[PDB]
Design a protein around this ligand. Structure first.
Ligand SMILES: Nc1ncnc2c1ncn2[C@@H]1O[C@H](COP(=O)(O)OP(=O)(O)NP(=O)(O)O)[C@@H](O)[C@H]1O
Ligand SMILES: Nc1ncnc2c1ncn2[C@@H]1O[C@H](COP(=O)(O)OP(=O)(O)NP(=O)(O)O)[C@@H](O)[C@H]1O
Ligand SMILES: [Mg+2]
Ligand SMILES: [Mg+2]
Lengths: 352, 357
């Protein structure tokens, strides 16, 4: 049987399918090491909200991120939104094997989960015997619609990839966030930290106390508001405008007429997100603010946010202590670091 | 399977590192938070004599209780553990098999055809394998790495763990565990473990093991019936002490003055002579003509200023193994006792380090 470990000699790809891009990350373990990484832009309306709509379009883009990454791995960990997952702890009969529970859960899930039985993808974990009654066990349940799973399974299939693990995004963030312990000066158990993930069309506040998420809020603020003022003012395309953010080269009036106002729009948004959280719970302050997402790469945006809020702020970098494959561009990776938090957390799932 | 789902927050649970040897049983529990490790629990429970002869468990009930007793001394709630068999118990061989066969299909055939590729009889073999890839000689066949041992070596350790309420999730090999713990010595060695070529000398009670480690991998292994019991036996005889008495005075001291010149010094030289021959055996065997470092392991490596002697007499930089140098410690863990037992826990640590690789 599989008690044997006579041979010392598995890693999975971290694939984050977003609305504007597909991100791939490969990790190894000894100390961690980045074997490969790539980001491939998506066609518009290919992924609306957190749902894949144009099936074949995502597949092609998924196929293109593989060649750009240039890897031989073919299994991957993908993530669904936490909004699609229902988590609850129920009581079931004791003395049942995991196979028996799984079967009964295929039969009787509709009673515990709001989704219609046909459409339920359920996951469970026996916590242990109920303290009250030795006849019953406490069973943790996490379920989502099979639609969320199958569409990602099919989308990965178009690139010859297989979904080894269907993870949840909030959990993957926690895993990669734990790698930030070095940069904060204490292990994350000590701290309550507000992670601000500033994407292209969405900004997310995630408060993590001792490593576990207590708060999540989302707003329609993002980096696309920055691009579209670049497109508009300078007559550049979506592709051209995006590079000008990284590469620069925009005329002198860029800072004062476009970038500085957007920074203020970021600061005001981060400020508003934090105020929503304070008035919604027991917490009166946060220890740190961690900027994540592509828009977090804006020069000295961390310093400005630190000023206007008064809370310690840093740009997320899960690859700070990691080693790098020679074929991985160290400069490119550093600039895309705060956008790879989710992709990093999915890749960290491989070692469990 | 149908569960391709990772919707529930995995525990990512660790395992106990249990090193069952001929004279003692050692336990170690590890965790990690940042880049720094932490010793959650550890205890050592001595074994009855003739309970484990050579690398074989002989008294099943006797081993289990000492195993069960260590748990309590360590005071841990973990019930799953990693145990290790000796590399001398493992046959390693690379064979060619039909291509296009699944992992499941190959294992089924390997259970029947085990006898053909392995020295052991069909009924008494525990076989492990890994597909490497297409064979170079013939692209129609695949290379499969085999590692196998006698089923008895595994089963008695599983049953012995069961009697203490423990489960052997992983049956490891002692040499691999040594490699994992040896990596932690990067700080003390003044160089990365990936670069250096190091001869690790594990001086036990009844067994001495030489392991040459180049870039992290084992290339050489030689064993001798030389050990620290030779020192303990001389203490028993000359001063009328018991095995327990002799062992305690070995560490704590307080014996009469003639002990150094007539007992301790001759044994020290006997240690140096032993290490000398092993390295000479190794240089006159393989391609290597010299090594960068010598790492002393086993409780006998705790002998005061023994490290300098071996270092001076051989002419190679030498260090006493301590895998808990950079590690953090649980409050319930004796920081002083661990230090004195540090070099003896190389194998037990590597068994616990199995979870973090
Ligand atoms: N160096 C940079 N400076 C400023 N902005 C950048 C930089 N690099 C990337 N961006 C912006 O970062 C955004 C992409 O962030 P990313 O986190 O990948 O979004 P997303 O989470 O994939 N999409 P969504 O969450 O659906 O809105 C793009 O709009 C870019 O404009
Ligand atoms: N302070 C000390 N100084 C010198 N020797 C010591 C000291 N403390 C313990 N020892 C001895 O170091 C020896 C090493 O023990 P250890 O290597 O754990 O035994 P073992 O390897 O389990 N048995 P074997 O399989 O025969 O090697 C023990 O026999 C102790 O007698
Ligand atoms: Mg995002
Ligand atoms: Mg030993």
């Amino acid at each position: 049987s599989h008690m044997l470990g006579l041979i010392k000699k598995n890693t999975l790809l971290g694939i984050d399918i977003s609305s504007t891009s597909v991100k791939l990350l490969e990790l190894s373990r000894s100390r961690y090491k980045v074997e490969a990484y790539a980001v491939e832009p998506l066609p518009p309306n290919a992924v609306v909200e957190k749902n894949i709509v144009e099936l074949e379009g995502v597949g092609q883009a998924l196929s293109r991120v593989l060649v750009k990454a240039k890897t031989n791995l073919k299994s991957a960990v993908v993530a669904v939104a936490g909004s699609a997952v229902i988590t609850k702890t129920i009581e079931m009969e004791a003395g049942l094997s995991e196979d028996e529970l799984e079967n009964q859960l295929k039969i009787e899930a509709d009673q515990y989960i709001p989704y219609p039985l046909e459409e339920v993808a359920i996951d469970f974990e026996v916590q242990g015997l109920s303290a009250r009654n030795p006849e019953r066990v406490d069973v943790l349940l996490a379920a989502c619609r099979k639609e969320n799973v199958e569409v990602r399974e099919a989308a990965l299939a178009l690139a010859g990839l297989t979904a080894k693990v269907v993870d949840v995004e909030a959990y993957a963030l926690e895993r990669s966030y734990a790698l930030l312990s070095s940069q904060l000066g204490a292990d994350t158990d000590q701290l309550t930290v507000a992670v601000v993930d500033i994407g292209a069309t969405m900004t997310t506040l995630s408060v993590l106390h001792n490593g576990r998420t207590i708060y999540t809020r989302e707003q329609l603020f993002g980096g696309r508001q920055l691009t579209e003022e670049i497109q508009r003012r300078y007559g550049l395309s979506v592709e051209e405008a995006g590079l000008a953010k990284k590469q620069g080269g925009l005329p002198d009036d860029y800072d004062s007429e476009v970038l500085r106002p957007f920074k203020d729009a970021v600061v005001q948004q981060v400020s508003r997100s934090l105020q929503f959280f304070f008035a919604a719970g027991q917490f009166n302050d946060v220890d740190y603010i961690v900027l994540a997402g592509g828009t977090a790469s804006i020069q000295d945006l961390d310093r400005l946010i630190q000023q206007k809020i008064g809370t310690p702020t840093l740009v997320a970098n899960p690859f700070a202590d990691m080693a790098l494959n020679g074929k991985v561009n160290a400069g490119a990776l550093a600039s895309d670091a705060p956008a790879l938090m989710i992709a990093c957390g999915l890749a960290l799932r491989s070692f469990d």
